[PDB]
CSV table of C-alpha atoms in Angstrom, one decimal:
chain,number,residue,atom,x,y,z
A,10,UNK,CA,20.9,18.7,-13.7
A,11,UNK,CA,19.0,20.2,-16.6
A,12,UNK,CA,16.8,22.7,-16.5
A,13,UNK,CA,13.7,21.0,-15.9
A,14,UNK,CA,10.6,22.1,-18.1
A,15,UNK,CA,8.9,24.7,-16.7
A,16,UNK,CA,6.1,26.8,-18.3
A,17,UNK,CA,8.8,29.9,-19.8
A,18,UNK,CA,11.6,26.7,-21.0
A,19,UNK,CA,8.8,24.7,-23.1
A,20,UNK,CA,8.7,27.1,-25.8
A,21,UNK,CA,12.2,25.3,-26.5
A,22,UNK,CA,9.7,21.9,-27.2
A,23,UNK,CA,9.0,22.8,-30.7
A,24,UNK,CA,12.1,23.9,-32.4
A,25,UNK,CA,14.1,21.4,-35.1
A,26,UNK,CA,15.6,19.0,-32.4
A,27,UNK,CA,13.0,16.3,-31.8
A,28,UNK,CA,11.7,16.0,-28.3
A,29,UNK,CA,9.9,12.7,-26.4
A,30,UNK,CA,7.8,13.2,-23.6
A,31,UNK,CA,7.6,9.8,-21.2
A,32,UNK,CA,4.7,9.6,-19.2
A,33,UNK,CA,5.2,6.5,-16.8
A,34,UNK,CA,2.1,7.0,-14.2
A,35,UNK,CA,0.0,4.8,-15.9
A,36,UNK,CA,1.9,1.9,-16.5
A,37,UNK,CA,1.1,0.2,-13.8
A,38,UNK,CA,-2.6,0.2,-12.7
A,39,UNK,CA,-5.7,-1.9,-11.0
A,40,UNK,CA,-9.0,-1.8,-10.5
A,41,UNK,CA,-10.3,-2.6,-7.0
A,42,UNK,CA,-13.9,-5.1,-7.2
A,43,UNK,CA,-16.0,-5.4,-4.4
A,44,UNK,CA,-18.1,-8.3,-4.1
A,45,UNK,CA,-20.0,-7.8,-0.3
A,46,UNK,CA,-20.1,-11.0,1.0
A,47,UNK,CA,-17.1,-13.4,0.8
A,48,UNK,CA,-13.6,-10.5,-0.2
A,49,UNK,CA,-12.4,-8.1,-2.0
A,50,UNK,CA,-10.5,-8.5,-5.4
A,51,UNK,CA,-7.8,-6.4,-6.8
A,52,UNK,CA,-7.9,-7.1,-10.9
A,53,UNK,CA,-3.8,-5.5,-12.1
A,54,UNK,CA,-5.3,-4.2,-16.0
A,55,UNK,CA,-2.7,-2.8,-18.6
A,56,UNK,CA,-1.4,0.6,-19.2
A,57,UNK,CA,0.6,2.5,-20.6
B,21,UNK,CA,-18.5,5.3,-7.7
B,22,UNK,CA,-16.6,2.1,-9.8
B,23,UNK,CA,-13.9,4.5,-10.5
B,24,UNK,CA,-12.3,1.0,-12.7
B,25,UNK,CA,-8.5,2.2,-13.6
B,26,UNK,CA,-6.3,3.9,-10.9
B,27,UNK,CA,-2.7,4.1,-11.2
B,28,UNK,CA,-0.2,2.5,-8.8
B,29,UNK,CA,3.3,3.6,-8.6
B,30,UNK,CA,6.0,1.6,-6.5
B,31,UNK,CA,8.5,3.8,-5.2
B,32,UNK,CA,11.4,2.9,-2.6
B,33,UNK,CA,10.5,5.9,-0.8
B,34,UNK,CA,10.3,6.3,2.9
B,35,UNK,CA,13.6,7.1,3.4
B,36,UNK,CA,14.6,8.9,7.1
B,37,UNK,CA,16.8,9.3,10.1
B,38,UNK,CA,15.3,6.8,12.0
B,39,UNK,CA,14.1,9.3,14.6
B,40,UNK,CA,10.2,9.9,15.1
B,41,UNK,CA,8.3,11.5,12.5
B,42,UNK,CA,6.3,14.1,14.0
B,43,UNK,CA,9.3,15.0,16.5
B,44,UNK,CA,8.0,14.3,20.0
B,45,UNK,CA,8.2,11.8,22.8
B,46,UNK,CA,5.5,9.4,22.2
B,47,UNK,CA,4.8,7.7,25.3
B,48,UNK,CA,2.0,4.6,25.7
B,49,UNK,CA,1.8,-17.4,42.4
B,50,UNK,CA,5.3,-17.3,43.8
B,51,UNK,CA,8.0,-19.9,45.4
B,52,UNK,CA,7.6,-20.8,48.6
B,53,UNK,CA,9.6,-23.9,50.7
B,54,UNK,CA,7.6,-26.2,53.1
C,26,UNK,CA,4.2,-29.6,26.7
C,27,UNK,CA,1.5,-32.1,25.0
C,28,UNK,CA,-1.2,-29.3,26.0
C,29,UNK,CA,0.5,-26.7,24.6
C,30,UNK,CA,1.5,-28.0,21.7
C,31,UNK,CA,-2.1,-28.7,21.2
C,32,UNK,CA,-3.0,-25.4,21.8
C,33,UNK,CA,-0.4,-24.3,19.2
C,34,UNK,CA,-2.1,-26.1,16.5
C,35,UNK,CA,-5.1,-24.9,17.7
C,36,UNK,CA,-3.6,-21.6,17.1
C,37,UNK,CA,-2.4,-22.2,13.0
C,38,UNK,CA,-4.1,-20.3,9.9
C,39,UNK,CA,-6.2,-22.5,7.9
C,40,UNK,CA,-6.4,-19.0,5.5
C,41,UNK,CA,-2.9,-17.2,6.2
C,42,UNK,CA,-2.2,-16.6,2.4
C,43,UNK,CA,0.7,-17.2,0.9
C,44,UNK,CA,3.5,-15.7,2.1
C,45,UNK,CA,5.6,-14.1,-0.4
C,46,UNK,CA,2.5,-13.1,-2.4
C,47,UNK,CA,1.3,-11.8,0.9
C,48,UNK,CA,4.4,-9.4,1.1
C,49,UNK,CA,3.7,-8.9,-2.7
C,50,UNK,CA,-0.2,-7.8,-2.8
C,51,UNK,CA,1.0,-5.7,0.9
C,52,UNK,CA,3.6,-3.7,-1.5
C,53,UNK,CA,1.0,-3.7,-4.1
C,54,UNK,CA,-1.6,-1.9,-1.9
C,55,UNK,CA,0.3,0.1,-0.2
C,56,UNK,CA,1.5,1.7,-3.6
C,57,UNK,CA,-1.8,1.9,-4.0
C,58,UNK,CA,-3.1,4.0,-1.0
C,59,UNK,CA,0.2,5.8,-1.1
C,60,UNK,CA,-0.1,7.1,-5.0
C,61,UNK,CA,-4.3,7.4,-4.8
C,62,UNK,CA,-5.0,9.4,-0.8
C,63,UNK,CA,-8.7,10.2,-2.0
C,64,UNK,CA,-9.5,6.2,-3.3
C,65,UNK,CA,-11.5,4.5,-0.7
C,66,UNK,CA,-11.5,1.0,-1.8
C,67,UNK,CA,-7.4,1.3,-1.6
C,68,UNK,CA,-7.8,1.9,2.4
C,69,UNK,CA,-10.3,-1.1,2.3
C,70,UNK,CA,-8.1,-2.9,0.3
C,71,UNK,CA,-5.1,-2.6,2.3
C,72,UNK,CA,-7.1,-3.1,5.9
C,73,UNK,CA,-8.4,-6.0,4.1
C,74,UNK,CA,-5.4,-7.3,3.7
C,75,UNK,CA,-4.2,-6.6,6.7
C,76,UNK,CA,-7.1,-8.5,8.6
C,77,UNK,CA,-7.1,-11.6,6.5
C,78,UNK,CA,-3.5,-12.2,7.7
C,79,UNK,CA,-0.9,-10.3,10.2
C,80,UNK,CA,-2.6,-8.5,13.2
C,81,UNK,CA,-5.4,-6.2,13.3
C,82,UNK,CA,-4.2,-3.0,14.9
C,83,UNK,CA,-2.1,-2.0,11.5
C,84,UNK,CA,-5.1,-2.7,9.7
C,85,UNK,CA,-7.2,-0.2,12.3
C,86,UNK,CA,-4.6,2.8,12.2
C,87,UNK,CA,-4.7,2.3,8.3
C,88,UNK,CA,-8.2,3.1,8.3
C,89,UNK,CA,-8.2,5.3,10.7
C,90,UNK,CA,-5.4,6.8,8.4
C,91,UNK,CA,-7.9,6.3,5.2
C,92,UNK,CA,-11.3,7.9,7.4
C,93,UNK,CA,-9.8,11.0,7.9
């Protein structure tokens, strides 16, 4: 399992072999919508 | 606050052994012939 | 039997949910609460959900989960 990229590896980010970084938290997300009398709505918006 | 936008993430986590999780003992007219 | 088979439809949900989207939006929120702690309308989402269908003693140890 590779090194994984701590904060003395990262300086290895920026040499000639191009690097991705994928960032998958906000992919899925919702907003949660209170109206007080009747329920309570949970609206799924995009990400990314 | 609205706080609109809030990340979800679904995991299959909650793996265990089963056993308890903090580990202690958690404890909580009629017949008749005539 | 006739009396309690009465009682037993006496007993149905006229607002259950729908029941594999009940299991869905019960994943959903408990994703939810599990990935936000410090959100409050997650825990009142989730108990929510949890009263509207179910029982209601889950849905007062979740709060009592989200209160403290």
């Amino acid at each position: 399992t590779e090194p994984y990229l701590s904060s003395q590896n990262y300086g290895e980010l920026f040499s000639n072999q191009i690097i991705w970084f994928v960032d998958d938290t906000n992919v899925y997300r919702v907003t949660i919508h209170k109206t007080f009398e009747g329920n309570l709505t949970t609206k799924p918006i995009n990400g990314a | 606050d609205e706080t609109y936008g809030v990340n979800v993430q679904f995991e299959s986590d909650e793996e265990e052994g089963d056993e308890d999780v903090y580990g202690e003992v958690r404890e909580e007219c009629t017949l008749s012939a005539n | 039997p006739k009396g309690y088979l009465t009682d037993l439809n006496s007993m149905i949900p006229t607002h259950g949910g729908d029941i594999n989207d009940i299991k869905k939006a019960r994943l959903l929120l408990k994703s939810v609460r599990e990935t936000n702690p410090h959100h409050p309308p997650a825990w009142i989402a989730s108990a929510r959900l949890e009263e509207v269908t179910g029982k209601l003693q889950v849905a007062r140890n979740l709060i009592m989960k989200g209160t403290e």
